[PDB]
């Protein structure tokens, strides 16, 4: 989530 | 983002 500053599947 | 969990366009 939120631009990649959160990881997470796609 | 997150299926819903926080507000989001989509």
Same mark, same amino acid.
């Given at each position: +989530? @939120? /631009?990649?500053? @959160?990881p997470? +599947? /796609?």
């Open positions: +989530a @939120f /631009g990649x500053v @959160f997470q +599947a /796609g």
